mmCIF file of C-alpha atoms in Angstrom:
data_model
loop_
_atom_site.group_PDB
_atom_site.id
_atom_site.type_symbol
_atom_site.label_atom_id
_atom_site.label_comp_id
_atom_site.label_asym_id
_atom_site.label_seq_id
_atom_site.Cartn_x
_atom_site.Cartn_y
_atom_site.Cartn_z
ATOM 1 C CA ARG A 11 0.000 0.000 0.000
ATOM 2 C CA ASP A 12 2.611 2.642 1.019
ATOM 3 C CA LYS A 13 4.313 2.323 -2.403
ATOM 4 C CA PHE A 14 0.913 2.427 -4.149
ATOM 5 C CA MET A 15 -0.379 5.364 -2.096
ATOM 6 C CA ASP A 16 2.846 7.267 -2.698
ATOM 7 C CA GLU A 17 2.179 6.940 -6.413
ATOM 8 C CA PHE A 18 -1.461 7.928 -5.929
ATOM 9 C CA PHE A 19 -0.330 11.185 -4.320
ATOM 10 C CA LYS A 20 2.134 11.708 -7.169
ATOM 11 C CA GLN A 21 -0.820 11.362 -9.566
ATOM 12 C CA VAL A 22 -2.986 13.793 -7.586
ATOM 13 C CA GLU A 23 -0.220 16.417 -7.684
ATOM 14 C CA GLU A 24 0.127 16.118 -11.466
ATOM 15 C CA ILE A 25 -3.601 16.449 -11.870
ATOM 16 C CA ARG A 26 -3.711 19.586 -9.711
ATOM 17 C CA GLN A 27 -0.920 21.164 -11.776
ATOM 18 C CA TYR A 28 -2.735 20.323 -14.999
ATOM 19 C CA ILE A 29 -5.991 21.783 -13.668
ATOM 20 C CA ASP A 30 -4.180 25.002 -12.611
ATOM 21 C CA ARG A 31 -2.596 25.101 -16.064
ATOM 22 C CA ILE A 32 -6.088 24.948 -17.639
ATOM 23 C CA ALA A 33 -7.369 27.569 -15.183
ATOM 24 C CA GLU A 34 -4.516 29.961 -16.162
ATOM 25 C CA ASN A 35 -5.062 29.209 -19.834
ATOM 26 C CA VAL A 36 -8.773 30.012 -19.469
ATOM 27 C CA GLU A 37 -8.019 33.455 -17.983
ATOM 28 C CA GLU A 38 -5.648 34.051 -20.915
ATOM 29 C CA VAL A 39 -8.236 32.926 -23.437
ATOM 30 C CA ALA A 40 -10.535 35.536 -21.876
ATOM 31 C CA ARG A 41 -7.891 38.223 -22.429
ATOM 32 C CA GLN A 42 -7.455 37.134 -26.101
ATOM 33 C CA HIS A 43 -11.234 37.424 -26.627
ATOM 34 C CA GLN A 44 -11.238 40.904 -25.165
ATOM 35 C CA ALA A 45 -8.195 41.976 -27.200
ATOM 36 C CA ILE A 46 -9.536 40.532 -30.456
ATOM 37 C CA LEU A 47 -12.922 42.227 -30.086
ATOM 38 C CA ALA A 48 -11.716 45.540 -28.621
ATOM 39 C CA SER A 49 -9.645 46.863 -31.547
ATOM 40 C CA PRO A 50 -10.987 47.833 -34.959
ATOM 41 C CA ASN A 51 -8.388 45.534 -36.535
ATOM 42 C CA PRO A 52 -7.287 42.618 -34.364
ATOM 43 C CA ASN A 53 -3.607 41.745 -34.227
ATOM 44 C CA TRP A 54 -3.349 38.510 -36.195
ATOM 45 C CA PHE A 55 -1.117 37.166 -33.418
ATOM 46 C CA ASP A 56 -4.069 37.521 -31.034
ATOM 47 C CA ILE A 57 -6.114 35.103 -33.095
ATOM 48 C CA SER A 58 -3.247 32.638 -33.585
ATOM 49 C CA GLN A 59 -2.528 32.782 -29.813
ATOM 50 C CA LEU A 60 -6.206 32.085 -28.947
ATOM 51 C CA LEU A 61 -5.971 28.967 -31.119
ATOM 52 C CA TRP A 62 -2.742 27.938 -29.312
ATOM 53 C CA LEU A 63 -4.300 28.190 -25.798
ATOM 54 C CA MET A 64 -7.360 26.206 -26.941
ATOM 55 C CA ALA A 65 -5.066 23.492 -28.341
ATOM 56 C CA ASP A 66 -3.232 23.381 -25.013
ATOM 57 C CA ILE A 67 -6.481 23.201 -23.054
ATOM 58 C CA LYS A 68 -7.765 20.308 -25.199
ATOM 59 C CA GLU A 69 -4.463 18.475 -24.775
ATOM 60 C CA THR A 70 -4.190 19.088 -20.989
ATOM 61 C CA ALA A 71 -7.919 18.297 -20.344
ATOM 62 C CA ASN A 72 -7.461 14.932 -22.102
ATOM 63 C CA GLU A 73 -4.571 14.145 -19.767
ATOM 64 C CA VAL A 74 -6.641 15.016 -16.726
ATOM 65 C CA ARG A 75 -9.470 12.810 -17.989
ATOM 66 C CA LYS A 76 -7.096 9.878 -18.502
ATOM 67 C CA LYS A 77 -5.379 10.171 -15.180
ATOM 68 C CA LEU A 78 -8.684 10.633 -13.352
ATOM 69 C CA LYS A 79 -10.072 7.538 -15.129
ATOM 70 C CA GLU A 80 -6.951 5.653 -14.013
ATOM 71 C CA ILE A 81 -7.641 6.495 -10.340
ATOM 72 C CA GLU A 82 -11.343 5.705 -10.787
ATOM 73 C CA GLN A 83 -10.603 2.236 -12.103
ATOM 74 C CA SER A 84 -8.143 1.568 -9.269
ATOM 75 C CA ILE A 85 -10.813 2.562 -6.719
ATOM 76 C CA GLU A 86 -13.353 0.227 -8.393
ATOM 77 C CA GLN A 87 -10.784 -2.599 -8.202
ATOM 78 C CA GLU A 88 -10.223 -2.291 -4.439
ATOM 79 C CA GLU A 89 -13.938 -1.626 -3.820
ATOM 80 C CA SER A 90 -13.823 0.443 3.263
ATOM 81 C CA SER A 91 -10.324 1.336 4.465
ATOM 82 C CA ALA A 92 -8.841 4.692 5.396
ATOM 83 C CA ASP A 93 -6.683 4.561 2.253
ATOM 84 C CA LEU A 94 -9.561 3.860 -0.144
ATOM 85 C CA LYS A 95 -11.739 6.560 1.368
ATOM 86 C CA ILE A 96 -8.821 8.981 0.968
ATOM 87 C CA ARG A 97 -8.597 8.082 -2.677
ATOM 88 C CA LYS A 98 -12.356 8.276 -3.137
ATOM 89 C CA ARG A 99 -12.549 11.713 -1.477
ATOM 90 C CA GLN A 100 -9.621 13.128 -3.466
ATOM 91 C CA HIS A 101 -10.922 11.862 -6.781
ATOM 92 C CA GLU A 102 -14.308 13.462 -6.104
ATOM 93 C CA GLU A 103 -12.619 16.793 -5.266
ATOM 94 C CA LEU A 104 -10.470 16.716 -8.389
ATOM 95 C CA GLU A 105 -13.491 15.857 -10.535
ATOM 96 C CA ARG A 106 -15.349 18.860 -9.132
ATOM 97 C CA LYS A 107 -12.427 21.208 -9.720
ATOM 98 C CA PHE A 108 -11.952 19.912 -13.241
ATOM 99 C CA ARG A 109 -15.622 20.195 -14.227
ATOM 100 C CA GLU A 110 -15.744 23.679 -12.701
ATOM 101 C CA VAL A 111 -12.767 24.963 -14.763
ATOM 102 C CA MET A 112 -14.081 23.379 -18.016
ATOM 103 C CA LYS A 113 -17.566 24.811 -17.378
ATOM 104 C CA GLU A 114 -15.999 28.270 -17.000
ATOM 105 C CA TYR A 115 -14.094 27.639 -20.240
ATOM 106 C CA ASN A 116 -17.324 26.863 -22.128
ATOM 107 C CA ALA A 117 -18.955 30.004 -20.732
ATOM 108 C CA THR A 118 -15.933 32.068 -21.926
ATOM 109 C CA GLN A 119 -16.300 30.641 -25.434
ATOM 110 C CA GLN A 120 -20.036 31.182 -25.542
ATOM 111 C CA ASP A 121 -19.502 34.860 -24.658
ATOM 112 C CA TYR A 122 -16.893 35.232 -27.412
ATOM 113 C CA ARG A 123 -19.303 33.805 -29.908
ATOM 114 C CA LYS A 124 -22.115 36.133 -28.777
ATOM 115 C CA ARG A 125 -20.001 39.277 -28.519
ATOM 116 C CA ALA A 126 -18.401 38.717 -31.898
ATOM 117 C CA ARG A 127 -21.813 38.437 -33.473
ATOM 118 C CA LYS A 128 -22.772 41.735 -31.872
ATOM 119 C CA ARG A 129 -19.611 43.394 -33.213
ATOM 120 C CA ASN A 130 -20.411 42.036 -36.670
ATOM 121 C CA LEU A 131 -23.899 43.582 -36.446
ATOM 122 C CA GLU A 132 -22.570 46.997 -35.410
ATOM 123 C CA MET B 8 -4.173 -16.064 -28.685
ATOM 124 C CA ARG B 9 -5.518 -14.782 -31.980
ATOM 125 C CA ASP B 10 -8.957 -14.110 -30.462
ATOM 126 C CA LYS B 11 -7.293 -11.704 -28.080
ATOM 127 C CA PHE B 12 -5.528 -9.915 -30.919
ATOM 128 C CA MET B 13 -8.526 -9.934 -33.283
ATOM 129 C CA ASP B 14 -10.742 -8.458 -30.603
ATOM 130 C CA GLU B 15 -8.140 -5.742 -30.216
ATOM 131 C CA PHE B 16 -7.941 -5.292 -33.994
ATOM 132 C CA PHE B 17 -11.698 -4.764 -34.193
ATOM 133 C CA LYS B 18 -11.476 -2.257 -31.356
ATOM 134 C CA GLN B 19 -8.673 -0.410 -33.196
ATOM 135 C CA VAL B 20 -10.931 -0.371 -36.267
ATOM 136 C CA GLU B 21 -13.833 1.266 -34.380
ATOM 137 C CA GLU B 22 -11.413 3.901 -32.978
ATOM 138 C CA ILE B 23 -10.311 4.766 -36.510
ATOM 139 C CA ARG B 24 -13.951 4.827 -37.755
ATOM 140 C CA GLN B 25 -14.848 7.275 -34.974
ATOM 141 C CA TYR B 26 -11.916 9.510 -35.930
ATOM 142 C CA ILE B 27 -12.905 9.481 -39.569
ATOM 143 C CA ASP B 28 -16.514 10.358 -38.711
ATOM 144 C CA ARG B 29 -15.075 13.166 -36.548
ATOM 145 C CA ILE B 30 -13.179 14.465 -39.588
ATOM 146 C CA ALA B 31 -16.263 14.200 -41.819
ATOM 147 C CA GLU B 32 -18.306 16.179 -39.273
ATOM 148 C CA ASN B 33 -15.566 18.841 -39.068
ATOM 149 C CA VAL B 34 -15.478 19.165 -42.825
ATOM 150 C CA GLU B 35 -19.232 19.930 -42.961
ATOM 151 C CA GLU B 36 -18.656 22.538 -40.232
ATOM 152 C CA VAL B 37 -15.722 23.959 -42.154
ATOM 153 C CA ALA B 38 -18.049 24.409 -45.166
ATOM 154 C CA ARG B 39 -20.654 26.178 -42.964
ATOM 155 C CA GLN B 40 -17.907 28.477 -41.640
ATOM 156 C CA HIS B 41 -16.840 29.181 -45.216
ATOM 157 C CA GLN B 42 -20.448 30.107 -46.070
ATOM 158 C CA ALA B 43 -21.002 32.294 -42.975
ATOM 159 C CA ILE B 44 -17.669 34.111 -43.555
ATOM 160 C CA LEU B 45 -18.365 34.748 -47.248
ATOM 161 C CA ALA B 46 -22.067 35.644 -46.756
ATOM 162 C CA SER B 47 -21.587 38.360 -44.138
ATOM 163 C CA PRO B 48 -21.003 42.029 -45.039
ATOM 164 C CA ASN B 49 -18.665 42.472 -42.027
ATOM 165 C CA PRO B 50 -15.992 40.427 -40.309
ATOM 166 C CA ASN B 51 -16.961 38.014 -37.591
ATOM 167 C CA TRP B 52 -13.810 37.101 -35.690
ATOM 168 C CA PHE B 53 -15.522 34.186 -33.963
ATOM 169 C CA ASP B 54 -16.277 32.668 -37.323
ATOM 170 C CA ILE B 55 -12.616 33.104 -38.252
ATOM 171 C CA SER B 56 -11.468 31.633 -34.919
ATOM 172 C CA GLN B 57 -13.775 28.633 -35.257
ATOM 173 C CA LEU B 58 -12.711 27.911 -38.842
ATOM 174 C CA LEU B 59 -9.106 27.806 -37.665
ATOM 175 C CA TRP B 60 -10.016 25.633 -34.710
ATOM 176 C CA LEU B 61 -11.742 23.160 -37.024
ATOM 177 C CA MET B 62 -8.727 22.992 -39.384
ATOM 178 C CA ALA B 63 -6.449 22.362 -36.384
ATOM 179 C CA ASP B 64 -8.702 19.515 -35.231
ATOM 180 C CA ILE B 65 -8.889 17.970 -38.696
ATOM 181 C CA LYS B 66 -5.087 18.041 -38.950
ATOM 182 C CA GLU B 67 -4.630 16.561 -35.473
ATOM 183 C CA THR B 68 -7.265 13.836 -36.015
ATOM 184 C CA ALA B 69 -5.996 12.843 -39.480
ATOM 185 C CA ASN B 70 -2.478 12.416 -38.202
ATOM 186 C CA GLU B 71 -3.789 9.949 -35.645
ATOM 187 C CA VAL B 72 -5.646 8.120 -38.353
ATOM 188 C CA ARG B 73 -2.530 7.876 -40.510
ATOM 189 C CA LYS B 74 -0.536 6.657 -37.507
ATOM 190 C CA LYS B 75 -3.129 4.055 -36.473
ATOM 191 C CA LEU B 76 -3.611 2.805 -40.046
ATOM 192 C CA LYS B 77 0.167 2.638 -40.487
ATOM 193 C CA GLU B 78 0.496 0.604 -37.318
ATOM 194 C CA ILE B 79 -2.089 -1.855 -38.683
ATOM 195 C CA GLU B 80 -0.374 -1.922 -42.117
ATOM 196 C CA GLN B 81 2.934 -2.991 -40.436
ATOM 197 C CA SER B 82 1.227 -5.631 -38.294
ATOM 198 C CA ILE B 83 -0.171 -7.151 -41.506
ATOM 199 C CA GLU B 84 3.117 -7.006 -43.500
ATOM 200 C CA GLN B 85 4.837 -8.799 -40.606
ATOM 201 C CA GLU B 86 2.247 -11.615 -40.431
ATOM 202 C CA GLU B 87 1.939 -11.895 -44.242
ATOM 203 C CA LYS B 88 -2.583 -17.661 -49.282
ATOM 204 C CA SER B 89 -3.337 -15.476 -46.280
ATOM 205 C CA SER B 90 -5.463 -17.104 -43.566
ATOM 206 C CA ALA B 91 -9.096 -16.034 -43.079
ATOM 207 C CA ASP B 92 -8.325 -13.671 -40.167
ATOM 208 C CA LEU B 93 -5.488 -12.036 -42.090
ATOM 209 C CA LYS B 94 -7.805 -11.504 -45.024
ATOM 210 C CA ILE B 95 -10.371 -9.990 -42.649
ATOM 211 C CA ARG B 96 -7.698 -7.555 -41.460
ATOM 212 C CA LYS B 97 -6.455 -6.641 -44.949
ATOM 213 C CA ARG B 98 -9.922 -6.061 -46.368
ATOM 214 C CA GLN B 99 -10.873 -3.846 -43.371
ATOM 215 C CA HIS B 100 -7.639 -1.881 -43.597
ATOM 216 C CA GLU B 101 -8.328 -1.314 -47.295
ATOM 217 C CA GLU B 102 -11.874 -0.127 -46.532
ATOM 218 C CA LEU B 103 -10.626 2.316 -43.880
ATOM 219 C CA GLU B 104 -7.955 3.772 -46.217
ATOM 220 C CA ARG B 105 -10.621 4.397 -48.917
ATOM 221 C CA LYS B 106 -12.940 6.160 -46.507
ATOM 222 C CA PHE B 107 -10.074 8.168 -45.107
ATOM 223 C CA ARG B 108 -8.851 9.253 -48.583
ATOM 224 C CA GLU B 109 -12.444 10.117 -49.476
ATOM 225 C CA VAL B 110 -13.046 12.391 -46.454
ATOM 226 C CA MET B 111 -9.676 14.197 -46.881
ATOM 227 C CA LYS B 112 -10.282 14.589 -50.642
ATOM 228 C CA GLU B 113 -13.594 16.289 -49.801
ATOM 229 C CA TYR B 114 -11.788 18.503 -47.269
ATOM 230 C CA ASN B 115 -9.310 19.630 -49.960
ATOM 231 C CA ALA B 116 -12.155 20.277 -52.454
ATOM 232 C CA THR B 117 -13.914 22.308 -49.742
ATOM 233 C CA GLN B 118 -10.762 24.431 -49.329
ATOM 234 C CA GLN B 119 -10.282 24.848 -53.087
ATOM 235 C CA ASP B 120 -13.812 26.331 -53.173
ATOM 236 C CA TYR B 121 -13.259 28.704 -50.267
ATOM 237 C CA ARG B 122 -10.143 29.986 -51.944
ATOM 238 C CA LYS B 123 -11.970 30.463 -55.272
ATOM 239 C CA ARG B 124 -15.141 31.886 -53.749
ATOM 240 C CA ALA B 125 -13.229 34.250 -51.463
ATOM 241 C CA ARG B 126 -11.409 35.675 -54.525
ATOM 242 C CA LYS B 127 -14.801 36.259 -56.250
ATOM 243 C CA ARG B 128 -16.239 37.853 -53.113
ATOM 244 C CA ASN B 129 -13.136 40.016 -52.793
ATOM 245 C CA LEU B 130 -13.642 41.114 -56.435
ATOM 246 C CA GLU B 131 -17.127 42.474 -55.636
ATOM 247 C CA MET C 21 27.671 2.755 -25.769
ATOM 248 C CA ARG C 22 28.444 6.307 -26.989
ATOM 249 C CA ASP C 23 28.155 5.437 -30.697
ATOM 250 C CA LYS C 24 24.439 4.607 -30.588
ATOM 251 C CA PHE C 25 23.768 7.862 -28.714
ATOM 252 C CA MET C 26 25.775 10.092 -31.078
ATOM 253 C CA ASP C 27 23.920 8.545 -33.987
ATOM 254 C CA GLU C 28 20.715 9.458 -32.189
ATOM 255 C CA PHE C 29 22.027 12.960 -31.472
ATOM 256 C CA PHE C 30 22.773 13.616 -35.146
ATOM 257 C CA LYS C 31 19.319 12.333 -36.119
ATOM 258 C CA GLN C 32 17.832 14.747 -33.554
ATOM 259 C CA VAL C 33 19.917 17.512 -35.099
ATOM 260 C CA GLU C 34 18.588 16.799 -38.619
ATOM 261 C CA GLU C 35 15.019 16.788 -37.379
ATOM 262 C CA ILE C 36 15.553 20.140 -35.686
ATOM 263 C CA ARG C 37 17.025 21.468 -38.947
ATOM 264 C CA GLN C 38 14.028 20.310 -40.979
ATOM 265 C CA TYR C 39 11.739 22.067 -38.462
ATOM 266 C CA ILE C 40 13.765 25.307 -38.775
ATOM 267 C CA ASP C 41 13.676 25.253 -42.586
ATOM 268 C CA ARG C 42 9.948 24.582 -42.212
ATOM 269 C CA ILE C 43 9.575 27.748 -40.129
ATOM 270 C CA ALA C 44 11.672 29.599 -42.723
ATOM 271 C CA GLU C 45 9.469 28.505 -45.624
ATOM 272 C CA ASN C 46 6.360 29.514 -43.701
ATOM 273 C CA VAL C 47 7.810 32.945 -42.839
ATOM 274 C CA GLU C 48 8.230 33.736 -46.538
ATOM 275 C CA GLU C 49 4.636 32.598 -47.120
ATOM 276 C CA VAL C 50 3.522 34.864 -44.291
ATOM 277 C CA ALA C 51 5.313 37.663 -46.174
ATOM 278 C CA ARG C 52 3.427 36.775 -49.346
ATOM 279 C CA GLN C 53 0.125 36.810 -47.443
ATOM 280 C CA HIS C 54 1.064 40.174 -46.009
ATOM 281 C CA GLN C 55 1.600 41.493 -49.543
ATOM 282 C CA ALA C 56 -1.688 40.057 -50.787
ATOM 283 C CA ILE C 57 -3.667 41.498 -47.878
ATOM 284 C CA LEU C 58 -2.095 44.988 -48.270
ATOM 285 C CA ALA C 59 -2.279 45.071 -52.105
ATOM 286 C CA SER C 60 -6.045 44.474 -51.989
ATOM 287 C CA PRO C 61 -8.505 47.274 -51.262
ATOM 288 C CA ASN C 62 -10.988 44.707 -49.929
ATOM 289 C CA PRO C 63 -10.586 41.764 -47.524
ATOM 290 C CA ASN C 64 -9.930 38.322 -48.935
ATOM 291 C CA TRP C 65 -10.924 35.862 -46.230
ATOM 292 C CA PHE C 66 -8.942 33.068 -47.801
ATOM 293 C CA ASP C 67 -5.760 35.091 -47.547
ATOM 294 C CA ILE C 68 -6.600 36.066 -43.973
ATOM 295 C CA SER C 69 -7.526 32.532 -42.890
ATOM 296 C CA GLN C 70 -4.368 31.168 -44.576
ATOM 297 C CA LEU C 71 -2.149 33.826 -42.952
ATOM 298 C CA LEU C 72 -3.583 32.675 -39.598
ATOM 299 C CA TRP C 73 -3.039 29.006 -40.480
ATOM 300 C CA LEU C 74 0.607 29.741 -41.267
ATOM 301 C CA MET C 75 1.096 31.607 -37.979
ATOM 302 C CA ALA C 76 -0.420 28.696 -36.110
ATOM 303 C CA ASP C 77 2.020 26.326 -37.771
ATOM 304 C CA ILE C 78 5.065 28.514 -37.094
ATOM 305 C CA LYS C 79 4.024 28.627 -33.434
ATOM 306 C CA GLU C 80 3.531 24.866 -33.117
ATOM 307 C CA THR C 81 6.758 24.140 -34.988
ATOM 308 C CA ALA C 82 8.799 26.719 -33.118
ATOM 309 C CA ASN C 83 7.527 25.087 -29.922
ATOM 310 C CA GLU C 84 8.757 21.633 -30.877
ATOM 311 C CA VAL C 85 12.170 23.119 -31.786
ATOM 312 C CA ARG C 86 12.338 24.752 -28.350
ATOM 313 C CA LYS C 87 11.570 21.475 -26.570
ATOM 314 C CA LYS C 88 13.886 19.355 -28.752
ATOM 315 C CA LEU C 89 16.712 21.856 -28.123
ATOM 316 C CA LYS C 90 15.930 21.974 -24.364
ATOM 317 C CA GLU C 91 16.375 18.173 -24.205
ATOM 318 C CA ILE C 92 19.739 18.427 -25.933
ATOM 319 C CA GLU C 93 20.719 21.282 -23.577
ATOM 320 C CA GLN C 94 19.657 19.266 -20.508
ATOM 321 C CA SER C 95 21.616 16.214 -21.694
ATOM 322 C CA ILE C 96 24.772 18.368 -22.128
ATOM 323 C CA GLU C 97 24.326 19.829 -18.577
ATOM 324 C CA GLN C 98 24.363 16.412 -16.891
ATOM 325 C CA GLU C 99 27.401 15.051 -18.822
ATOM 326 C CA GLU C 100 29.094 18.431 -18.285
ATOM 327 C CA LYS C 101 37.304 19.553 -19.535
ATOM 328 C CA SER C 102 34.633 18.195 -21.891
ATOM 329 C CA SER C 103 35.217 15.212 -24.186
ATOM 330 C CA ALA C 104 35.175 15.642 -27.972
ATOM 331 C CA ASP C 105 31.694 14.161 -28.392
ATOM 332 C CA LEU C 106 30.386 16.505 -25.694
ATOM 333 C CA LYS C 107 32.047 19.441 -27.463
ATOM 334 C CA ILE C 108 30.537 18.390 -30.795
ATOM 335 C CA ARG C 109 27.134 18.443 -29.175
ATOM 336 C CA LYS C 110 27.541 21.868 -27.586
ATOM 337 C CA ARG C 111 28.807 23.451 -30.822
ATOM 338 C CA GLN C 112 25.892 22.008 -32.801
ATOM 339 C CA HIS C 113 23.400 23.032 -30.128
ATOM 340 C CA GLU C 114 24.777 26.557 -30.178
ATOM 341 C CA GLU C 115 24.578 26.694 -33.998
ATOM 342 C CA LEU C 116 21.021 25.358 -33.981
ATOM 343 C CA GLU C 117 20.089 28.028 -31.382
ATOM 344 C CA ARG C 118 21.584 30.852 -33.481
ATOM 345 C CA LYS C 119 19.724 29.653 -36.550
ATOM 346 C CA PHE C 120 16.404 29.362 -34.686
ATOM 347 C CA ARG C 121 16.670 32.870 -33.169
ATOM 348 C CA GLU C 122 17.558 34.230 -36.574
ATOM 349 C CA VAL C 123 14.456 32.742 -38.196
ATOM 350 C CA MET C 124 12.087 33.878 -35.450
ATOM 351 C CA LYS C 125 13.710 37.325 -35.503
ATOM 352 C CA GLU C 126 12.922 37.419 -39.226
ATOM 353 C CA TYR C 127 9.344 36.384 -38.348
ATOM 354 C CA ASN C 128 8.864 39.184 -35.834
ATOM 355 C CA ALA C 129 10.324 41.768 -38.270
ATOM 356 C CA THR C 130 7.770 40.520 -40.823
ATOM 357 C CA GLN C 131 4.888 40.996 -38.431
ATOM 358 C CA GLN C 132 6.161 44.451 -37.358
ATOM 359 C CA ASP C 133 6.408 45.538 -40.978
ATOM 360 C CA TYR C 134 2.853 44.394 -41.738
ATOM 361 C CA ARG C 135 1.470 46.235 -38.730
ATOM 362 C CA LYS C 136 3.159 49.457 -39.805
ATOM 363 C CA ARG C 137 2.264 49.256 -43.496
ATOM 364 C CA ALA C 138 -1.309 48.354 -42.509
ATOM 365 C CA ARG C 139 -1.669 51.450 -40.366
ATOM 366 C CA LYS C 140 -0.272 53.574 -43.174
ATOM 367 C CA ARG C 141 -2.766 52.077 -45.620
ATOM 368 C CA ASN C 142 -5.581 52.640 -43.143
ATOM 369 C CA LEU C 143 -4.651 56.342 -43.082
ATOM 370 C CA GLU C 144 -4.520 56.506 -46.897
#
């Protein structure tokens, strides 16, 4: 167990860092939306950079999904000890954080789509 | 155990079929973005952003298809009158290549049109 | 053995070189797109979309070159008077760095030029 819990905590740390990375990328995406729609003529490099953050978010999100699935399957295999509860409780928390950040990301995109349509109509 | 490896082959096949469908769907969306962009009297930077996103996803997905099909191609050349199971694998790999060439050919055609239609639009 | 790892190093070098030439090709094409966009009184959404596609690709490719060089740099730090193989690797790494900076410098200058010319046109 100690060796297997040590690894579990290594996994949780990586997931947290990935989630923070998405969080930071989502703030940045929001800044790119604002910059693109603020100026008469957008800097091209603001549109290319928006694409690059989205690519990074897709790639990072996939990794969080995989790693979270890994933990989930390991819980189902052992399925109640202190260690298993710990793992169950941490997975739940990471799932909540991850869904929260992605939900915020979708809202940010929806607003870009709406606001760009309003600019187009002006 | 062949059964183990055939089951896996058929799973690899479904993966590839899902990725090709994903490409097909993106190509239709690329055409809609082309139409929205060319039909509007003003820029819409979301439409431009989404077109670019779609082209990035097509590229990424197609690369995976090429890789996965390649991997199957090699697996066949190594094992290769072929047995029944080998024939099953070759025939399926052929079918997937055709579909994949067909969706990418349609993508290219779609892009050839955007280029031509955007020049016409520009000339108005 | 060293041999197998120098062979690998030189293969890594060639791949990094192909990526840099790829960026260089694309930077010229970005220039061409800049010309087309400025020489045309109206927008051409194909030219604009394709400019953006090229920028995307430069950015992805540049990124891979940065990571591939960082690996080489990190391998030199651990092994690191140096042996001849080690020296060979440092010299090549340094040359590859120079060449990469040069091409991205060219890319920024190209973007700065467009921005300026564009503003001028806008005023005309």
